[model samples]
Target: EAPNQALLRILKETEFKKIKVLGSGAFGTVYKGLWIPEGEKVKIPVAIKELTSPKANKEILDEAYVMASVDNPHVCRLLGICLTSTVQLITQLMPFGCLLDYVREHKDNIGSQYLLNWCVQIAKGMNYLEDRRLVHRDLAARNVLVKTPQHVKITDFGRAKLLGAEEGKVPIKWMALESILHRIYTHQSDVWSYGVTVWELMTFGSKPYDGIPASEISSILEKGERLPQPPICTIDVYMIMVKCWMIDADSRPKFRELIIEFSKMARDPQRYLVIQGDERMHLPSALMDEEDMDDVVDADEYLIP
Candidate 1:
């Protein structure tokens, strides 16, 4: 394995150029950019985030550590931090952006067969995290990205806790009912969220349970309610999504199991496509979601949040 690399560049040495605001949260804002170390092969541009607030910085750095420790094709690989100039972290730049955004914009025009690939990629990423014994408290599409149209990587570890999902601030809408009511998070809770992620993919990035207020979405889940199958969701595919919704977290399939199933579906795209025929309809890509860090106190410290 290649050793972890860090530029730790001084302001004078590495003046990274601006790309765009990827997203932001209480911790800090993430930016898309190019970071050419003083001497290096021109890697594709990167994602950078700086820590300005000490409080959030500590938790944020924990995620950096967690990210750096794991290496998998499905997981977003960490690109080291530069403390010399600012507390900046660099990660591999993904061309397709967030999974939810990609789907929302293109859901109409994109074929269902391709969306199945998205579902498969996400399962694979989660499988990697499961293997590492990491519980990404947040596993919604919002935390997932497209590496290529064919690949997906999990990101945003601000809420990851290898041990605690029951505690901490999580997006309630995407949360598993057990985690919300019992104040605990487990890999199964992640599977619950994975079910929701699959829901987002099928519905073309529609908000999970938007019909219910965000405050109450957890209740619906606890009562054994779930987002209806996406318009194009086939029975074969949605059954898996439903399995993830089992109130008994133990009843949910492991990422490993989900990955194998999705791999099978990916192997036979025609069976997974929503509306089949030689004349595959194409919908122009649609737009996407943002983390609501604005309500977060001291949100001003970050931009594109």
Candidate 2:
């Protein structure tokens, strides 16, 4: 195996120029930037994450190295790292931005087939990580980028850690019961988060566990409560989410299985994406705790009409 450090390509800071801010939150702001590689006259658009926290420097570098070792169409491509007064991690810019906003803005036009395509993409990407024993500590719609209306790339690895490593903060709403209670992260735990991501996509970027206090979420889960099926999510897709929320982490379906299932659904989405009368119930309205968002940068703005 090649050392992660060996896989990383460091870029000259001068080659990257920030164009505009994409989003900002707890860690730092993500900028739409232009990257002109050394000896190349062509300019490329890239998302530059300006990591500001003292603890995040290592996190971004670790993520850069980890992403450098991965090469998959569904996963974000890490271009290189820039070490400057404010350290930055450069990556291929998704013109449509995050899946959360992308779907919300285009919800009226995009169909379930498009949603299933994204599901397959995320499954394929996460399966690759599972095969490599990498745990995406944070996984949600906001962390996923839209390459096109029909394609998505999983991004934001600053919170990712190898299955055998650790973490500082986690997405409480998207976490598995075991992860929240024991702090044990594994491929199964990420599977749980995947279920929530499906819910987010179906709801057009609605907050997970909307209205539920983060403090009480633990008890709610302990009582066997799970996120409800969105009005837009079909029973078939919701069943997949249900499997991911299985109380026993070991019982959850692996990403490989999800890939096959979602791909099959995508092949004939009209057949499997049918919604029932009862699936259209109105979801409760509630406030979300900012702490519950963790490092997710783009959740709040979509709340606006």
Candidate 3:
């Protein structure tokens, strides 16, 4: 059974209000609380997510179950659970906000090596989630939080669900073809999302649906149109994205394969570097023109479909 509001008061009295506020969300704000019972004056920052409704409760439990089962270094660790007036996810605090913030702050300094290394780590985390029959439906730059130069922690499991759960919400442009049409959320669907995330990192945090309005993004996705690749993304990375967005989810490479591919690029990035007069990495081949893509669908159906 889920814990009640009284539990939260007890938690507050025990050890959760001493730290600072790290961030906020729709359900509840995350506080960087410290755990003192474990050791000497050391501070361990934890994310305390408080849910207000029954829906939020289920979501928190689902996330806890998934996070608790995962033990990958690249994945965020679920330290403990606090059942209070709301459901609080006691987890590690990733200092670097999200990949979006990191890339935006260091766009010019971002290189193939950095992008590929991050991608590999993300793949490792995603692969672990997939192996456990889970799907991080909302895999985006904003959902990937950075810890250091080479470390990343996958967060925001609010939209995450088990592989077989009836499709709830699908981020169209980043979704696999099957996921877009059939409304089935699978591990491969996450691969498609990861592909778009790669593009996000490569472009130093370019918005996925750049010029197109949010209302038009869904219809365009259902028609099989993909997010246009930004100029900064290399041909190899772009090709990987194409493979990930393949119409058939089964055709998409597994996260393990993606890890290997990104690892290779990280080790020797000069091979995929974009240079002057490089026709292969040019606009025509790198990105699809708006006219060449699919038509837009209704926004209402887009989310449920």
Candidate 4:
């Protein structure tokens, strides 16, 4: 049951008429709402999430607790919460939308510098979470929201958890091998997901294992198959991904190391620029040639449902 006083407070303070739906999922729907001070004519924008199920109430509380515990610019800030018949989580509004949308519309124009900048931003957020010993189990393109051209804020803590704390369970495929096989999750598992998130950013929001089935993807990973090569992924970046997916979770680079490497890439533009002045460059030979595609596997054979 929701508190009547809290419901009345939200209805009286929040501008419901101006609220715009942003996104939806199994848990609930998100809306962009306006917050107006007592005497101010101008309204500030905030993202409000409304829970769809009672089961999600605990998840909402968990997310609120997590966000409140951390204080960082790279991480999304929770403004407030409204407990009506459903839970409404209020957070900072990211005007630029998600990384997936940004990359999808501007892939061709996105230079390595831009990609690296975003990756570093993500890493910064990850580092902050790791410092708090938090695990963002669902680090992906869809979860990384941008506030501006160069600023990013990591969101969606529904599947997140404190590393040593007990929380809702979910099967995480992007996790490191040890986590997948032994059911032992750690900060390194988040690092593994971060690597995949980097690939998603560099590849213009393409879904991981795009054509491959989830079960097959899991099977391949179990057998030590690394992520399939993307047409535009750089060797350096690919190597980083391989390191993140190493069979031993302890071997994965810490979030600080990832931030440093990605920052270097962001600071150096020429190293990642595929096309120069007036020349269009070809894809990497190993990435282009069929013979070099020995590691490529058929994705359709591994469908889950």
Best TM-score goes to which candidate? Answer: 2
Mind giving the per-residue lDDT tens digits that candidate 1 earns over 175-290?
88877787678889899889988888878788766667767776666666777876576788889999998888899999888978887887776676565441466533312122
What is the lDDT of every predicted structure here?
Answer: 0.71, 0.78, 0.69, 0.69
Deviation from native of the Cα of residue 2 in model 2, angstroms: 6.4
Tens digit per residue, CA lDDT, model 2, 254-287:
9999999999998987776653432333211112
Positional deviation of 252 in candidate 1, in angstroms?
A: 0.9
How much is 211 displaced in model 3, in angstroms? 4.1
Per-residue lDDT over 197-282 for candidate 4, one digit per residue giving the tens place of the 0 to 100 score: 88787667877776776556668887777766666666777788778888777898988998888777766656753433313322
lDDT winner: 2
Looking at candidate 4, what is the lDDT of residue 245?
Answer: 83
List of clashing residue pairs for candidate 4 = none
Candidate 3 stretches with Cα past 4 Å from truth are: 1-13, 38-42, 52-54, 167-170, 211-215, 222-224, 274-305
Q: What residue runs in model 1 are displaced by over 4 Å at the alpha carbon?
A: 1-15, 19-27, 41-43, 84-86, 164-169, 276-305
lDDT of 3 by residue, 1-305 (tens): 33322221123336545367777655467776554323333334455666537787877777776666566677775666777666777766665668888889876565656667888899998998887677888888888987666678687776787777773344665666666566778899899899889888877778787777655765776686876766766778788988998877899999999999988887777676553333323111012122422432211112110
- In order, how many clashes per candidate? 13, 0, 5, 0
